[PDB]
Design a binder for this molecule. Structure first.
Ligand SMILES: CC(C)CN(C[C@@H](O)[C@H](Cc1ccccc1)NC(=O)O[C@H]1CO[C@H]2OCC[C@H]21)S(=O)(=O)c1ccc(N)cc1
Ligand SMILES: [Cl-]
Ligand SMILES: [Cl-]
Lengths: 99, 99
């Protein structure tokens, strides 16, 4: 796909068996999803942005299907106002910014 | 250019005669720059990111160079942790997301 940026670049993802909407976010180092359960071990992290920091759970080796493309990597879970797909998984689906 | 996302997509911007670095951010509706002086009047705006809301100063029709492309549009000024180029100016330079 080629996604213009007139609107928020939202896509459908599948994570933990669940279908969700998420923002493709080149400004995010890592993927951050709204509170949900995921399997396996986790450890706490703080992530910061405009407005300050939030505490998240870091889960490693999580598979997400993004717009029909499979990716694996770290997923942070916590009180983000929006589900964000960050660069750690955008790279795996071969996403680029072109102009 | 085609910019991959293994590293942060940082580019040089030029505003007010000054070079700065900024993050190309498809997850930002708005362009938000760290405190600096800009000409003209400003209007209030609140923007909401990961850890909460902040007040910023909204300046309209500001001339800004982004990775060597000219844009003229809205620039928000406030305590952002990094200079961010949002969709309002990414559309002006013709950026798309591709995968
Ligand atoms: C601010 C950047 C350095 C980092 N942010 C990614 C960014 O794209 C967020 C992502 C975002 C999007 C919506 C709500 C919260 C956060 N957008 C954002 O704060 O944009 C603000 C300016 O334009 C506005 O439109 C969106 C909110 C405003 S972040 O959400 O704080 C973030 C930080 C660390 C990680 N791992 C993941 C995400
Ligand atoms: Cl990862
Ligand atoms: Cl690559």
């Amino acid at each position: 796909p080629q996604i213009t940026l007139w609107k928020r670049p939202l896509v459908t993802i599948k994570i933990g068996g669940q279908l969700k909407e998420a923002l493709l976010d080149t400004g995010a180092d890592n993927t951050v999803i709204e509170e949900m359960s995921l399997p396996g071990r986790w450890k706490p992290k703080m992530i910061g942005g405009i407005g300050g920091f939030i505490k998240v759970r870091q889960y490693d080796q999580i598979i997400i299907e993004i717009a029909g493309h499979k990716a694996i990597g770290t997923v942070l879970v916590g009180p983000t106002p929006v589900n964000i797909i960050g660069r750690n998984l955008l790279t795996q689906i071969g996403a680029t910014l072109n102009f």
